[PDB]
Amino acid sequence: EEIFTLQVRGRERYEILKKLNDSLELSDVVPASDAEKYRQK
Amino acid sequence: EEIFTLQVRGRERYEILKKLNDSLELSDVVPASDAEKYR
Amino acid sequence: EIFTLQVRGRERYEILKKLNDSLELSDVVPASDAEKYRQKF
Amino acid sequence: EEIFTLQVRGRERYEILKKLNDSLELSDVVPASDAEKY
Ligand SMILES: [Zn+2]
């Protein structure tokens, strides 16, 4: 999945919230083994 | 000021980011002097 | 109840501290006060 | 490289910030090369 639109005022909050949102989405698709491997280097 | 929108997957995630948004806004409009006192 | 969050690196620390400081502020500003401050927008 | 600590009030807030931390650490190490791959 259900998809919501978050309204954000200004570039500063937008950039912070996009960064968080994009990070959370990345963690939903990178496999646990791949994630650990990236974290080692 | 410009309004941006973000597509958020999942209700729980939406509620966390909206809460951060609202708290970030508040922190941007409370002067530091007022904030230290409230703290 | 108070928890300690361990953070690696100054850039992640500054982002997380900003979020945490902001949440704490939203806790101690009364609702009517908060409303009057939001007018600026 | 520096290690930092943050005092968080309340377990649900701790859970939120911990997840953001863990996510952000992954985002910092996944290269651009592999971006379309996920
Ligand atoms: Zn600001």
Residue numbers in the entry:
A (entry chain D): 302 to 342
B (entry chain C): 302 to 340
C (entry chain E): 303 to 343
D (entry chain F): 302 to 339
Give the exact sentences the study uses for this entry.
Overall, the zebrafish p53 tetramerization domain adopts the canonical tetramer structure of human p53, which is composed of a dimer of primary dimers with approximate D2 symmetry, but importantly, it has an additional helix that engages in subunit contacts, reminiscent of p63 and p73. Individual subunits within the tetramer adopt a z-shaped conformation, consisting of a short β strand followed by two α helices (H1 and H2). The sharp turn between the β strand and helix H1 is facilitated by a strictly conserved glycine (Gly311), whereas the turn between the two helices is stabilized by a proline (Pro332) at the N-terminal cap of helix H2, which is strictly conserved in p63 and p73. Depending on the mobility of the C termini within the crystal lattice, we were able to build the model of helix H2 starting at Pro332 up to Met344. This helix reaches across the adjacent primary dimer within the tetramer, resulting in antiparallel packing of two H2 helices. Tyr339 plays a key role in stabilizing the H2-mediated subunit interface. The H2 helix is tilted by approximately 50° relative to the orientation found in p73, with the conserved proline at the N-terminal cap acting as a hinge.
The tetrameric transcription factors p53, p63, and p73 evolved from a common ancestor and play key roles in tumor suppression and development. Surprisingly, p63 and p73 require a second helix in their tetramerization domain for the formation of stable tetramers that is absent in human p53, raising questions about the evolutionary processes leading to diversification. Here we determined the crystal structure of the zebrafish p53 tetramerization domain, which contains a second helix, reminiscent of p63 and p73, combined with p53-like features. Crystallographic studies on the zebrafish p53 tetramerization domain then confirmed the presence of the p63/p73 signature helix in p53 proteins of a subgroup of bony fishes, providing evidence that the last common ancestor of p53, p63, and p73 also had an extended domain with an additional helix that was subsequently lost in many modern-day p53 proteins as a result of divergent evolution.
